[PDB]
Amino acid sequence: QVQLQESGGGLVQPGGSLRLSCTASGIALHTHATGWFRQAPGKEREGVSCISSGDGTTYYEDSVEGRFTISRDNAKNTVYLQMNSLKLEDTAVYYCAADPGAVCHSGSYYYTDDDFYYRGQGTQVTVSS
């Protein structure tokens, strides 16, 4: 009965900045690995970023390198996804998900395959003029 709550998103001008936040209710952080997956209308869902369980190795996708940052704090048990320099094609709904262990890039595996045990409702981020 563990839920993951998301906050943030909305109407943001291109070139702006945002900070999505995902908070775990039942489970705690720095034991699972939490990733972000975005979905666009008429497209299939693609991951954004991840933090591993211990300490945290930050992995980023090809289209989101150099702009998007990820961070995690255990005082508030919250993962933070910081949006900088948004382009017009980033209009999407974002979901935070958690999987136990160091799921992100262990061995010949990578977190593109969406098989995370915990999911979330997701928030809409829209760029327009």
Binding site: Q1, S25, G26, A28, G101, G107, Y117
Partner: peptide, 25 residues
Amino acid sequence: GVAGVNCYFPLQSYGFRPTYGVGHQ
């Protein structure tokens, strides 16, 4: 409460997949 902030579930499960390498095997 059953769960919430500053109240962590102690029983943690393993996530295993054949695509993993050694160490997490």
